[PDB]
Amino acid sequence: APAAVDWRARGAVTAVKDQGQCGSSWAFSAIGNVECQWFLAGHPLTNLSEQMLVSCDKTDSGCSGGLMNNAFEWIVQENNGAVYTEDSYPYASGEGISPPCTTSGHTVGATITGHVELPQDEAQIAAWLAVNGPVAVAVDASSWMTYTGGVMTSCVSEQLDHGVLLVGYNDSAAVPYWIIKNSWTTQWGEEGYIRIAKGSNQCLVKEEASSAVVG
Ligand SMILES: O=C(Nc1nc2ccccc2[nH]1)c1c[nH]nc1-c1ccc(F)cc1
Numbered sequence: 001a002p003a004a005v006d007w008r009a010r011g012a013v014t015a016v017k018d019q020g021q022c023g024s025s026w027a028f029s030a031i032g033n034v035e036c037q038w039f040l041a042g043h044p045l046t047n048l049s050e051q052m053l054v055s056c057d058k059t060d061s062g063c064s065g066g067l068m069n070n071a072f073e074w075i076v077q078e079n080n081g082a083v084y085t086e087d088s089y090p091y092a093s094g095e096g097i098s099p100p101c102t103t104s105g106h107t108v109g110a111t112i113t114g115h116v117e118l119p120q121d122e123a124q125i126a127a128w129l130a131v132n133g134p135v136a137v138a139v140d141a142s143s144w145m146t147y148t149g150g151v152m153t154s155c156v157s158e159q160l161d162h163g164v165l166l167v168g169y170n171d172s173a174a175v176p177y178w179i180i181k182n183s184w185t186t187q188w189g190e191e192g193y194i195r196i197a198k199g200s201n202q203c204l205v206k207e208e209a210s211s212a213v214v215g
């Protein structure tokens with residue numbers, strides 16, 4: 001692996017989104033990861049549908065919480081692999097209300113065929129990420145409300161409560177760090193993003209890393 005990676009600069013990452021008040025940090029992580037994989041497959045970067053998962057993924061509990069791997073498993077095994085575009089199934093649960101499931105011909109933004117889990121190794125994840133693109137990970141965002149910007153180093157690492165998207169790292173800097181895409185708009189943190197120290201398992205980042213697999 002290289003000294004640094006940033007998939008935004010390779011134009012492979014969609015704009016930062018806003019989950020509003022809904023525990024759907026997963027849907028955003030899982031989907032965010034798929035948006036990138038679809039692009040890196042050779043296709044146009046399409047903004048995909050988080051609402052699809054909140055409403056339809058029954059394995060996951062909609063708004064009160066979910067898990068990225070269940071999404072990938074659900075999409076492939078219950079939804080025939082289909083991920084809808086956002087224009088055809090837009091986010092509604094911003095305020096907490098999650099509509100019912102639908103099928104009046106939504107548009108399929110991407111078709112995935114599986115997913116893979118990565119080891120609990122920050123270095124190995126970086127190895128995969130550098131080659132294959134943004135990785136979906138779970139973290140302990142207890143210490144994230146207070147976040148203004150900078151390389152975070154004293155992150156509470158006890159409870160996985162939040163789902164996000166790794167878009168690259170930087171092993172060259174004074175303090176090596178992961179670059180993480182977050183679903184709390186762009187006012188939060190560094191234009192929507194956040195940098196946590198790479199190597200010491202900040203925020204329990206290496207604990208639940210996975211990525212969808214296209215084609
Ligand atoms: O509730 C969430 N996750 C969760 N915990 C569970 C315990 C028992 C059964 C199902 C469960 N699902 C959740 C809400 N917002 N974000 C996440 C999230 C937390 C961890 C994670 F890895 C991914 C998402």
Ligand SMILES: Cc1nn(C)cc1C(=O)Nc1nc2ccccc2[nH]1
Nearest residue numbers: 019020021022023144145184185188
């Ligand atoms: C959503 C959600 N569900 N639960 C249980 C907590 C949250 C949450 O913290 N949202 C949130 N915090 C923010 C802090 C700063 C800016 C924007 C912010 N948005």
